Amino acid sequence: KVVSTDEYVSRTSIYYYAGSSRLLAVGNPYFSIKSPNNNKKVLVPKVSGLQYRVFRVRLPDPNKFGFPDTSFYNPDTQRLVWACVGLEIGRGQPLGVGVSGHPYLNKFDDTETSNRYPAQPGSDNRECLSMDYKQTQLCLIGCKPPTGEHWGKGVAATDCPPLELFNSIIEDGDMVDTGFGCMDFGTLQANKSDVPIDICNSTCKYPDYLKMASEPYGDSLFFFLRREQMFVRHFFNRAGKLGEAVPDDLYIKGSGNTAVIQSSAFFPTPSGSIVTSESQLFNKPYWLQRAQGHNNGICWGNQLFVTVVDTTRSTNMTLCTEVTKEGTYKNDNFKEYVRHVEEYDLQFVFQLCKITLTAEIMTYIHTMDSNILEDWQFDPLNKYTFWEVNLKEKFSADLDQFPLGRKFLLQSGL
Amino acid sequence: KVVSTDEYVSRTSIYYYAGSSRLLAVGNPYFSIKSPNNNKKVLVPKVSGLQYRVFRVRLPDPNKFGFPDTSFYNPDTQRLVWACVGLEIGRGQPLGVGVSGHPYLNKFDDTETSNRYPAQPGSDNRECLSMDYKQTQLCLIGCKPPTGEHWGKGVAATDCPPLELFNSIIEDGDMVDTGFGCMDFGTLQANKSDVPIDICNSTCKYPDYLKMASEPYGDSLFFFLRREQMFVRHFFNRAGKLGEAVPDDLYIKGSGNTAVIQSSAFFPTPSGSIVTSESQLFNKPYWLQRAQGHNNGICWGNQLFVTVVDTTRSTNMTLCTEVTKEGTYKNDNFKEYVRHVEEYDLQFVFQLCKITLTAEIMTYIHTMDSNILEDWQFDPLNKYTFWEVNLKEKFSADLDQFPLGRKFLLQSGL
Amino acid sequence: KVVSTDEYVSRTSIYYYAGSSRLLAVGNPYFSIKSPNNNKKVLVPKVSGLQYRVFRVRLPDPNKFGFPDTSFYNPDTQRLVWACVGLEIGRGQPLGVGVSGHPYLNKFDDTETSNRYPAQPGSDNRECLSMDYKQTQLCLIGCKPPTGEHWGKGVASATDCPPLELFNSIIEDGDMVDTGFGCMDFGTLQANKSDVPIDICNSTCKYPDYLKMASEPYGDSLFFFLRREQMFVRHFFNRAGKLGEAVPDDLYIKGSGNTAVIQSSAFFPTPSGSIVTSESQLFNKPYWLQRAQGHNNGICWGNQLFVTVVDTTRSTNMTLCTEVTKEGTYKNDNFKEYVRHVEEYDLQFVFQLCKITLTAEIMTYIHTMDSNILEDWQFDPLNKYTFWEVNLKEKFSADLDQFPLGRKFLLQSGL
Amino acid sequence: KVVSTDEYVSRTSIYYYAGSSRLLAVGNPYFSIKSPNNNKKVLVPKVSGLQYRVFRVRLPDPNKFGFPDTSFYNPDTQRLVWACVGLEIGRGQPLGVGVSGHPYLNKFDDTETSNRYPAQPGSDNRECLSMDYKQTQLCLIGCKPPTGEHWGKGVASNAATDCPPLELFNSIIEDGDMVDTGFGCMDFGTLQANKSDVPIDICNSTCKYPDYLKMASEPYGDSLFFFLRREQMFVRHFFNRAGKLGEAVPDDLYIKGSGNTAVIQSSAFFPTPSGSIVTSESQLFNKPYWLQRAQGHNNGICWGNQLFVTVVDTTRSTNMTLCTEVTKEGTYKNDNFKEYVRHVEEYDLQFVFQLCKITLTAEIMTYIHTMDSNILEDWQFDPLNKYTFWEVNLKEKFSADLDQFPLGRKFLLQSGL
């Protein structure tokens, strides 16, 4: 049914470089700040190292592109399309680790060494704690937005909410899993206090690698890299009513001080250990020679999708303003703010391709995607939020005038 | 006596892909919840990352399979059987570490730095503690269920129970070793308080690699991988009567505060350190080219057994329901639950094989297993618990339409 | 427009070694000590392992150099220039890690395990704490001073949070490298002078703008570079003072009683940089500049060179103690405590002599690239910056086998 | 000027093995013990894993050696000299880490997490602490004693500091000198007058670090025929010093406090190092080194019929605890026992030498004379005694039967003979 793109897409000797300039995002790493009384316009966006970066790269239409010589193909029976052969995801900020927390984190006791009896929380025993998240690096490249998975509230001896595994398109700004799982914390944790504030009212998504790899045409994952790591830093338990009590066959009942059983609703705090330059996935070129899927880097629709997660540059800068100048230090004389920045530099090398439009090939392309033939003269993604990267006026045939272009000339022997 | 399967099983050029869709398991990581009152129906199963996953894959009978052309073998003197040549164990959920504990853990004093004399009074000094288990990855593939070992109570100046090393069939759901050894904690630890609740009334089994490797025909281990790691996090001692006192020649008797000797029954807490993508054993293809045993991947009985242990995705999700909504936080207004999930996607590539049934080969096969000849027209495993994976209607000759199939075509050069 | 130097610069078989003597820097790792008078003359300089070392190496003019035989080129139509083909940055002193701190560090509570309610802050809750910084090794070699980036207070436009602007600047000798708190201007963005230790609290931390220096057309900044950074979070603290941006109400349920007053969610972590090893050392080993990724393949225009070095793996701070009053018993007031830091460098170079035929086309290319190249050849603005001047005009020798890096080059090239 | 020894030293096919027996050093790891007839005679020496081991290996004169056949060279116009081609530094005892401390360590507060105001008064707030030092492995081989560097008290100009002037000193590393421990290579006896800023085994000693740059840049290359090194350490804890802060923090770096924070605390921080972990995989010893081609001009030629092997190995620094019973009683009493600390070191040096001959032409005689006149004078054609070395006399340890020894068999397999 499905065939490789190498069987009906003819490669040419024409190569072009396309590089977006430096992309910056500066905001509050924990929450967005909206402008009153607008209650809809955001003045300071939420920019965190635990966010997905979904770049929608817009490519110019090669069939309407101003080539200096068009004698390499026949516009009467052939159409053109771009193919991605070189890619480098540039990262500018220094290596570092940021922290996230909650002023009312639902932590009762440290259950690691000493947690004797008796013990029973009051009505409000939340604490102001912080932690460092699981370290995650990943990059996905394709002509279709990636598909992610997360657990949500689904649809009786227990009052535990039913869990359902949901698939969704990963949009720019979505939170990645931090060590507490890939779930909808806003709907599955009603107290808003079990995880830090930057995810407590958000949904953490993990890329559904199995689904995106098992799709027939392979438009989602041309190529991908991933490096995750975490360990358990501390051991705590939850405050509140234990919904599922420990059955009687797992322990001998106590008495006296041990008469009232303590909450066995444990939860750990993660830590993505150390970050190193040696483990970096970025600032290095990737050559997309042969993809594992059937689509070998063909950018249908003249568009591209680059998904990036990089927690190795999650440093949160502390800013402090002086409200009142005095000869001695007073806490009420200063205001503290927290800001986070992200610096990207996407570099691409594209290969021009031609497709002879036979009746058989037109049938295959129509069954694959009718919009491909319609646009060739022979939209639903706007409801999602992406980082638009317009490279329509960024294409250049002079490869040796750019870093990735020179690297491509050395790699291919040109 | 025993000969390699390569000497009497003829390989063909026919290959088939078989793919197990997405498999999900959701439950309580510490204990199962049954129906009140039924004591036989289970509403919430026990699903933990420390459990064995024993998949019993059912293969279609090749002698009754609808092949498009059967001119490659002679059904009068030859029989068909499947051989496993390609395998990929798909893993979905993100990497993470979960914790387990006991609200009445038999911990007395922290014996790491400071434990002065005299010793804490009382009859019940158990504490509510938690820990992270030893990290264990392993996968076993074979046509016979795996054999595991565990220490249990045997029959016989100590009242210590006699220890006996037991072999048993590893069933789906059996607990793997967690750092406290592979033993029957339910029978050898009567107080139900020496290990956390998810193993305190269960049996931890470790694969008897030596027995399965030394078996004559080699039906258990076509291929296997393993990666274990742990270290000692904390040092504690047990409360209660020390059954075996330290002899007098190992210490000088004390006086005053040190008049009554403390319990020297020490025990450590493990810690499966850190998880990384670089150390993953799964989500990568295994090519069964030449097995170390005499069975070179022949799936006798048209069945298969895939055993998997993966604690690198043992994250326990915290769920929280709001029973009463109020303007201020109160602990009694919420219920806390703990859930764990597992996502698998088994992918197989099989090679069709033929066996010419000569008098010598029929005698050899009968001495190996009479049921092979009886079923060929020329049951006792139902008492055990396995995860049935029915692939009778999942075979396809179009390898390039699936991920593992494309990987297999690149590997073999076809 | 721009072409590689291999197309218009001809390589010769003449090689020269250049070796700097022993380079030492001794001072206070936290701050410089000036003279009671002028307040501008420095008695004790600031020498810290977290500082950039930007060596401006002066090379002798090859067009005015005394060669024993000048029959290899024609001065009427050709000019000479040096090309760097071998380099080894020698580093002295043992491996070690130093620490920096603040006697009035703005730390309130330890937010890692236990920070229960309620919280009653004061007016001055600063503490005397210390830490060890992020570990950073790097070396940049080029004929142009390096370009670094840092965040400073810009102008723009609401909330009273200061606007952030990304600034580029020339990395000068003595500038502070990022320590785990980011590359920012702490003097202007942290007014209380107490959020980071004293050695950076009134300074600017700069990070090399690798992207800008790599994307420049001629590639004069980065002939070659190495880098190794590492750090992890050691402790978790929170800030004292008014929280400028309060946590929105949709992220938590309000408390009551002891939990009525919310605690400060202005967290900040402490870096560490784990461990240093000899196996991870970037220095004391030769680098051979065979083919650069940029268009400039190691040509040292202007007869000068720039070597940028950061090495926190030798940041040990020596403790000195003087006895003011000698007594039979120990008294704290009888001694004075000092802190000193040292740095030992030994730069070694191997240069290859090159010739350039000055045709009308090549003269136009060089003029559009840099007119000062043609002007000096007979055919300054960097003085406002601070560099470590390394004068090698009288250090060139054609006898390569008489020096360590020269011998290593002779084995490498097969000469 | 300088030429390689391969250009004027002719190699022969004669090889000899020389192996020293088991070398042991047992003593107190923290300080030396004198005795009666004191301050001159030492009963218990200072033996610590943080010490340099500088072996001065004495070789027999090949020109006076009893060879079975002397027809391979002409004694009228040629002279003989040994060349080191094989070496194995054997190390005994198990791997382990020892600790050092000070009963009056100048520690004030733990400045890692909590150090609130105000600060404890006190005239003597020293504490009895210990630590594990930076891990260091190294071995240097040459025909000249090694040159080390250390910071000492210099000479100033008697402008507004009382800080002692620092001077970088070079010196010959003697057997028993202390290696750097993570506090730097300095003279703690002269630069730290209170004798309480570093543990007792270095507080009155000088820590030396090998001046690799000086020994590598020397013309003839007699110091470093070959060398290995592996150092590692990290910061375990954070403390600050007690006493008057000599250099106060300038006013532009902080806002002054008031009340509890009125008196500023000492910002004289110091960390404690910790040479992390030891492994067999990271061992430099118990393995053969083949000195085929040195980076210097001297290709392993043992001028003067002597050799220098410098070794530092902190991977076997375990300090054994000994306990004697002075009074036997039925119950434990602290005053009934005496506690001692001892440290041991076990070495086994193995060598494979190649016999060499040098034809003494007028040009070669001039080159050798300008290099070292004593070479020609001894050939018939002292100042190192003021230093302390571990003499390894191999004059009666040479054997021509290589296959009768471990390193000899390893050398025969390596060279294909």
Numbering used by the authors:
A (entry chain D): 20 to 174, 181 to 403, 438 to 473
B (entry chain E): 20 to 175, 182 to 403, 438 to 473
C (entry chain C): 20 to 176, 182 to 403, 438 to 473
D (entry chain A): 20 to 177, 181 to 403, 438 to 473
What does the paper say about this structure?
HPVs are nonenveloped, double-stranded DNA viruses that consist of multiple copies of the major (L1) and minor (L2) capsid proteins. Each of the 72 pentamers is composed of five copies of the L1 protein, which can self-assemble into an empty T = 7 icosahedral shell called a virus-like particle (VLP). HPV L1 VLPs are excellent immune antigens for prophylactic vaccines, as they authentically resemble the native virion in capsid structure and immunological function. Here, we describe two antibodies, A12A3 and 28F10, that specifically bind to and neutralize HPV58 and HPV59, respectively, through two distinct binding stoichiometries.
In the overall structure of HPV58p:A12A3, we note that only one A12A3 Fab is bound to the center of the HPV58 pentamer at a 70° angle to the pentamer surface. This 1:1 Fab-pentamer binding pattern is similar to that of the H11.B2 antibody based upon a low-resolution cryo-EM structure. The interactions between the HPV58p and A12A3 Fab buried a total of 846 Å2 of surface area, as calculated by PISA, with about 80% (679 Å2) buried by the heavy chain. In the HPV58p:A12A3 structure, the antibody binds across two adjacent HPV58 monomers—a and b—with six residues in the DE loops of different monomers (Q165a, D154b, R161b, Q165b, S168b, and N170b), and one residue (N308a) in the FG loop of monomer a. Particularly, 12 interactions mediate recognition between the antigen (HPV58 pentamer) and antibody (A12A3), comprising 2 salt bridges (D154b-R102H and R161b-D31H) and 10 hydrogen bonds involving both the main and side chains (Q165a-R65H, Q165a-Y60H, R161b-D31H, R161b-R102H, Q165b-R102H, N170b-Y101H, S168b-Y32L, and N308a-L94L). We found that HPV58p bearing an R161A mutation (HPV58p R161A) showed dramatically lower binding reactivity to A12A3 than the wild-type (WT) HPV58p, with a more than 70-fold increase in the EC50 (603.0 ng/ml for R161A versus 8.5 ng/ml for WT). Moreover, the decrease in binding because of the mutations is a result of a faster dissociation rate in the surface plasmon resonance (SPR) curves, indicating that the side chains of D154, R161, and N308 facilitate the stability of the antigen-antibody complex. In HaCaT cells, we found that D154A and N170A mutations in HPV58 PsVs notably impaired their infectivity by more than half, suggesting the involvement of these residues in the infection process. Our observations over the HPV58p:A12A3 structure indicate that the side chains of D154 and N170 (chains C, D, and E in the HPV58 pentamer) are located on the inner side of the central lumen of the pentamer and might be accessible for L2 binding, suggesting that these two residues may be involved in L2 interaction so that the mutation on either residue would affect virus infectivity.
